[model samples]
Target: IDQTALATEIKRLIKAAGPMPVWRYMELCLGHPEHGYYVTFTTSPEISQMFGELLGLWSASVWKAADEPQTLRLIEIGPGRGTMMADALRALRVLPILYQSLSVHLVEINPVLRQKQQTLLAGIRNIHWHDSFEDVPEGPAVILANEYFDVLPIHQAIKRETGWHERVIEIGASGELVFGVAADPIPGFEALLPPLARLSPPGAVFEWRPDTEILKIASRVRDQGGAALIIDYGHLRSDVGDTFQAIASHSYADPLQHPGRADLTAHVDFDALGRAAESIGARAHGPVTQGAFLKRLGIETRALSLMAKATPQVSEDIAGALQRLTGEGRGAMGSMFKVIGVSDPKIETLVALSDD
Candidate 1:
């Protein structure tokens, strides 16, 4: 609900449970159902329409690859503000049949996003909204998630001389939340840890998301016949690092400063994600850099085409947006973000991802 109630409940739990695990704390901070921090963003920028446009074409292409079924599900996970999906659907209209065949399913938990989505997608009659990805009706599905996987709950464990200790939040002496490791180690945690983490030096923090969501998408795509594309900022390999941080406003904030006030997130373990998918017999494709994937998908061409018709002022902004999207230099998003594809075993390749 609000910070006052959220903090009170968090402290109440701390007193009851001794110290709360980092993942549990994050889960509470994000959506404690009634008291957690739920954010409704004020109106923002509109420069990234290009991203939605390209991904729309991508969904169509994937549908064609899946034999262009008469019924196609363009499913999006946590589609914030429905901005990209709007652009994508517009792009898909070029192929009239694909547009006619499509049904839009947006899985959104946040009511603010849902209301914004309803307004944005009001003209589109075939669109549907649900709170869970699994609720989407079965068919040839092309699942897309932008900045989705990082928000999934992550367990933070510190590698110690004895074993991996669960990172936790306990009340301070005067009654403030503080981060610390558990007094004891998790029993036989290394048995399930990534191989690289087993030999990590002491005090290394290993973070991981549960295999539930990835495995769900992978298993669905594998059986139901479609592909899921997950694009987020994360590592390619499993390693040790504390990526747990809070983003208040557009700047970084202390993750534990105010529970539910800021977005708490950790870097995704893509290696772990691909492993989870593959373990379930789904074919895992490239975890390519977002820039490489976008460039390969012709983002530059899209920008140039749009730039050709724009006035000098708008043209310059487009140029900057292009640079931000695909450039890997300082503060560029290209290299920082990665794209991974999970498809049915029958489909050997995916768009913008390496086939070989």
Candidate 2:
């Protein structure tokens, strides 16, 4: 689609909705079900190699710290291409004791990707797939979610002269995407927000999604005795700003223009996630920068080891991968990405916990 048409659609939506909140616009652009970006397109390849041997080592550390030597459940959410888990499993092979005791569980919603993952991980014994975490069997487990939380549905409320009006989409006179504010404020909506965000400017908008999954994950770890790691691109603290966008073939696109043809994503709110986990009696660890967390976990050492055995040409690729994993540049993935961990309340002071 051309820029003019994209802008026209956006304007049309705004006219019908009387100025739609940014969050509502984002939801429609990214996930309209039939044309939802993720459902229709396959972008798992972008995430390939994003996982590494360090995660396996990290799991080993988690196991050692727990001081439980027996069976352990290993789980991942949205295991695109099964790359990260594969790398982790490869590293786990060094510790045969842990390898034998592990049961790999993948929680995925996409049927196409699930089949791809099954084939990708075919040789690995005891691997299973579940449509959601709710279906996974109860057991002590370690879990990881890469860019999972941002996809959950979010509600958008825009502060107006009267009160906070929910942002919704409606067809405009021009027959395009438009935003509208509800006639009334959400009952006690202010009570649901953090203190700092309660009095947003009249035009300021607030975005929040139900914390069901966070609570669920925390409940599992708290009761089953294990840890969970979350990696995503988001803000460490909640602030007022629009961080939603669309991408097609790795280039920016008008989110509303293409519907499901592109990848839609937004920055995660780490503070909300931490609060949700804590409320469920799970101990929340660092919502640390991805760069810091990976470095602390020794991703560089693992990268070097892989490079040492590789041919010169292959070694160059390894170096580039390492940079992609840790570097922050104009388009680098590391700086924007963040990592957080949650563990059973009984486990004191995890490796990623911040000093504060």
Candidate 3:
């Protein structure tokens, strides 16, 4: 979607369909096949090799808990450029039994990304790709969803004097896109919305996502016997806030101004995620802060060992990386991100999320 044309199409769609929901707006902007905003953003495939290796070890523990199934399907959702899988597979290569059982499945939407994954994972046997998670074959599985849920579509409601009004993007009197509220307050919203909504302040916005995605993962693991680990930026509890945000060219931008151009996402509600997993009878492990989880996983030990073999400056770099991954500060990845594990009842605990 070219900038001018995509914006025009969006305005036309709004005129044709009335003001659309925020989720639909997000889908159009970020889920467009031809030119989704997501395709433009690039980051290191794995934040750090250490992160994914720990994850690999984490998955191996799950595999062991599943009685070391003869075959294990390792599925990673939204594996951008396939770097993490590459790193994880490298770690798994050391464990002959686990390495032999590997069948890698990457769930990605962009063909370009799929191509990259293909190239990066070329030497790996049994590597497969799918546009939908459901399309993957049935098997005892180990699932990883890194930085995935935050980008999924979210619905928002704005509190008003009358009641909670559906937040919408509409054409203003000047023909510019502007935020507006639906005329009628959402019927029965009072009864069904989050408990915090009842006491929310005027003009505050509340966000939520359908549990469909989480439920799918939970049910699959529960029925087939496996575990899943989700890593992303989010809060520990479901709370009221306008976490919906956008960025373009590395700068914060007005989401309304850049249809199909700006990245639109919201902070994930981990509390909702755990609840959805439990609702399906799958066990929910800790929604632990990434810093603590990695510390508990012995990331600091791993970092020091890597530094021991590196040059002086390289050792300093590795030390800094460890802080970024496990320290708390404005730029630290540790505090801002979170990790949680979901598994079948048979697996009483997960290595990363619940391990002491």
Question: How many clashes (backbone N, Cα, C below 3 Å) per candidate?
Answer: 1, 5, 0
Highest TM-score, which number? 1
Per TM-score, what order, best first? 1, 3, 2
- The Cα local distance difference test for each model comes to 0.85, 0.75, 0.84
For model 1, which pairs clash?
1-35
Best-to-worst ranking by lDDT: 1, 3, 2
Model 2's alpha-carbon lDDT is 0.75
Better of 1 and 2 by lDDT: 1
Report the C-alpha displacement of residue 26, candidate 2, in angstroms: 5.9
Q: At residue 106, what lDDT does model 1 achieve?
A: 95
Stretches of model 3 off by over 4 angstroms after superposition: 1-3, 39-45, 248-251
What digit string (tens of lDDT, one per residue) describes model 2 on residues 151-242? Answer: 66566778876778887765556666556677788788878688898778898877777788899999999999889988887888887765
Return the top candidate by lDDT.
1
Pull out the clashing pairs in model 3.
Answer: none
